[PDB]
């Protein structure tokens, strides 16, 4: 939705992915039904019908990725980050997946001395790991800068 940077699309792409558990680009009422039951909720069949039909511009009946990207730019929370942090993250992230890893904080720390054990690398991860996948986001990376 052409206001979104490189790291947000990479966050929203896998965010689209764990909804879509059949390996395509279509959110039917089924897959959003499988999510909302796993949240412990009882999904109303009208509620499942409304939430798909509310954001579906093409009218096919399945939410694809550009419509999930359009919806998420509406319901974006906010971010007001810095130039120095964003340029730091794009150099730190090497393959460009939008994520710094445990394999990619070893490279940054070896770049400035700083002998870490592989345990202490993962001990750095879990402090910045707000949600949890064993990876630090861009939103979590900003959080570990402007804390002071």
């Amino acid at each position: 939705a052409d206001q979104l940077t490189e790291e947000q699309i990479a966050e929203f792409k896998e965010a689209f992915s764990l909804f879509d558990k059949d390996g395509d680009g279509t959110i039917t009422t089924k897959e959003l039904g499988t999510v909302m039951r796993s949240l412990g909720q009882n999904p109303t069949e009208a509620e499942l019908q409304d939430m798909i039909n509310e954001v579906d511009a093409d009218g096919n009946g399945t939410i694809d990725f550009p419509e999930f990207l359009t919806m998420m730019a509406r319901k974006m929370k906010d971010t007001d980050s810095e130039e120095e942090i964003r340029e730091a993250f794009r150099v730190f992230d090497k393959d460009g997946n939008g994520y710094i890893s445990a394999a990619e904080l070893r490279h940054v720390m070896t770049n400035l001395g700083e002998k870490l054990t592989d345990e202490e690398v993962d001990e750095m991860i879990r402090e910045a790991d707000i949600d949890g996948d064993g990876q630090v986001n861009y939103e979590e990376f900003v959080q570990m800068m402007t804390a002071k």
């Binding site: 949240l39 550009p66 720390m109």
Partner: protein, 644 residues
């Protein structure tokens, strides 16, 4: 080197021709008042050129002047055509410049003037080279897809672009999106460009046509190391069979990954390319499970049978060198009687006893083994290459050379035995240290010995080679210094330095501290000697041999996750080699076939896994729909200080 000198002279000359022309300078800034005064004249040179062979419309499009460019199109509509005629920017039209500058009004104005959407920017400044900072393509659709403008791509298709535009490299539009430095936004365009295909029957859909190297867009992401594009192209090639709670069972398609491959398949492309970013595709979702099922099942047992045949081969060669024929010395000791100790020599008619008939069997095992090496290795060197890319396959490297040099030195010994030449000690004593140190090849199939044999190689071509240039500086200076000190004295009470070849071999050993050091304690040594040897032992033993341990110790923890990535790529290179050379009676093809399961003729590999259940993530995106610690936090401040 002189081309960049010539290219800089072109850009300064272009700025000269603009200032020395009243049309081009007025089209440069904006000067909409000045164009109406010039273009109303009779001969106002509308087809004027420059250093890049550009017109006034190329200038107005390059410096982003919408107002001046429309005046040029009104007074002369022929300038929408007629691209640049220089060698550098050959073929680049004015539509190309408006697209790269990502202008929306100037592109739509040019398309109303019947611009060519199928022109080719086939200059030397658009080709894929390390000299150029960009590789955008040749066509306007290729330019709009790489600067990430979805408005102009949709605009160019509606005015009749070609979705299958191929370059001089043969690359389509989808190949160029992979070669771009912004991986995430290339994925967004890749879905868009396939969406407008949708009628590409052609007996070739869209993303299956290769370039002039035979690479599809799927395999080009494999070679160039686009980890982001590789995971995006996996969405088409998997099928979720069933989801049983926190347990899914996907079904990957091994039709472009598995090296059954009469064509060139993806495991050969990754393992032979020189990039260090392509070896990260060996950890992805179908490829990591494919290699392990080849290596555990059929890769490791066949590699440990070749490790045991070769080990019994190099024992059979060793006992032919121990029991080799010798006779006592024939004529005399009379070579000058103070420096000769050899007392046996080589025999001519060796095979005349029953104990040598056993050895003749053992030598024919060796020589036949030396021919078989030169028939399975040399017809890959002279055939697949003219030795241009044989050196570093992955980093595996020397074991091609050590097995050729072994098979050469056995056959030199065959020649010297048949013609009964004198010195067979020289071709043998190479052939043993080349022979047994090639057993280190078979230490890549064991995790204990695997990553250690890589660190031996990364020191010899590195932290040991740069030490042996500054060792040969030192032991040429001191060995020529110690030689002239003991040159004027007695060479039997201390004879470490009597010849200059011997003085080089003493000081090589005194640098290594493997022999003791010249001391007699009965006769007065030269007074200059004790000064120049105490100078020597400080910068040999106290300084420079304690600076290898400080340098190899510094390197060993820096490349300590690279050598683990190098070992997992040595298994893939071994597995593909064992799969290719062995027959099809052994080594069954990987994955389950699909003939008797209603899936076609291709080959599948299913992987099931337990993923998670992460509540805090899934609850945050769900509402959006609606109608040990102490020294870790010390490390982040160390990163905040480094970032600042």
């Amino acid at each position: 080197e002189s081309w960049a000198q010539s290219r800089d002279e072109q850009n300064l000359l272009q700025q000269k021709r603009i200032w020395e022309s009243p049309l081009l300078l007025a089209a440069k800034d904006n000067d909409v008042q000045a164009l109406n005064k010039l273009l109303k004249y009779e001969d106002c040179k509308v087809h004027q050129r420059g250093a890049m062979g550009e017109t006034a419309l190329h200038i107005a499009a390059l410096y982003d002047n919408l107002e001046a460019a429309m005046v040029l199109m009104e007074a002369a509509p022929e300038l929408v055509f007629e691209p640049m005629t220089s060698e550098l920017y050959e073929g680049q039209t004015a539509l190309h410049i408006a697209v790269v500058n990502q202008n929306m009004n100037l592109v739509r104005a040019l398309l109303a003037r019947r611009a060519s959407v199928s022109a080719r920017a086939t200059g030397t400044a658009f080709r894929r080279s390390p000299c150029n900072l960009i590789y955008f393509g040749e066509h306007p659709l290729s330019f709009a897809a790489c600067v990430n403008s979805e408005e102009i791509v949709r605009l160019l298709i509606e005015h009749g672009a070609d979705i299958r535009a191929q370059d001089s490299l043969g690359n389509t539009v989808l190949h160029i999106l992979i070669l771009q430095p912004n991986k995430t936004f290339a994925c967004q365009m890749y879905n868009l460009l396939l969406s407008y295909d949708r009628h590409g029957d052609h007996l070739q859909p869209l993303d299956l046509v290769p370039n002039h190297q035979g690479l599809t867009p799927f395999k080009l992401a494999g070679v160039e190391g686009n980890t982001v594009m590789f995971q995006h192209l996996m969405q088409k090639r998997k099928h979720t069979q069933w989801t049983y709670g926190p347990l899914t069972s996907t079904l990957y398609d091994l039709t472009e990954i598995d090296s059954s491959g009469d064509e060139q398949s993806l495991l050969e492309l990754i393992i032979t390319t020189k990039k260090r970013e392509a070896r990260q595709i060996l950890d992805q979702t179908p490829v990591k499970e494919l290699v392990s099922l080849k290596w555990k099942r059929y890769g490791r047992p066949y590699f440990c049978m070749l490790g045991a045949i070769y080990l019994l081969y190099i024992i059979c060669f060793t006992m032919c060198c121990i029991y080799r024929p010798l006779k006592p010395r024939t004529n005399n000791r009379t070579s000058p009687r103070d420096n000769t100790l050899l007392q046996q020599k080589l025999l001519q008619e060796a095979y005349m006893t029953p104990k040598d008939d056993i050895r003749l069997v053992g030598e024919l095992v060796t020589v036949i083994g030396a021919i078989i090496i030169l028939l399975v290795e040399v017809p890959d060197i002279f055939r697949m290459g003219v030795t241009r890319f044989f050196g570093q396959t992955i980093l595996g490297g020397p074991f091609h050379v050590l097995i050729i040099t072994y098979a050469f030195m056995v056959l030199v010994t065959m020649v010297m035995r048949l013609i009964s030449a004198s010195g067979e000690v020289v071709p043998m004593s190479f052939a043993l240290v080349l022979g047994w140190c090639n057993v280190m090849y078979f230490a890549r199939g064991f995790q204990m010995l695997g990553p250690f044999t890589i660190m031996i190689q990364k020191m010899i071509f590195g932290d040991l080679m740069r030490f042996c240039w500054l060792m040969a500086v030192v032991i040429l200076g001191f060995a020529s210094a110690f030689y002239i000190i003991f040159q004027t004295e007695d060479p039997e009470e201390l004879g470490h330095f009597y010849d200059y070849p011997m003085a080089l071999f003493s000081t090589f050993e005194l640098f290594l501290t493997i022999i003791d050091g010249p001391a007699n304690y009965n006769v007065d040594l030269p007074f200059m000697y004790s000064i120049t040897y105490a100078a020597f032992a400080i910068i040999a033993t106290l300084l420079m041999l304690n600076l290898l341990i400080a340098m190899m110790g510094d390197t060993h923890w820096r490349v300590a996750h690279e050598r683990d990535e190098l070992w997992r790529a040595q298994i893939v290179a071994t597995t593909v080699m064992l799969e290719r050379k062995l027959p099809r009676c052994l080594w069954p093809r990987s994955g389950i076939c699909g003939r008797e399961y209603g899936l076609g003729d291709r080959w599948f590999l299913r992987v099931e896994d337990r993923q998670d259940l992460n509540r805090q993530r899934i609850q945050r995106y769900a509402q959006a729909f609606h109608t040990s610690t102490s020294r870790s936090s010390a490390n982040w401040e160390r990163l905040r200080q480094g970032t600042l």
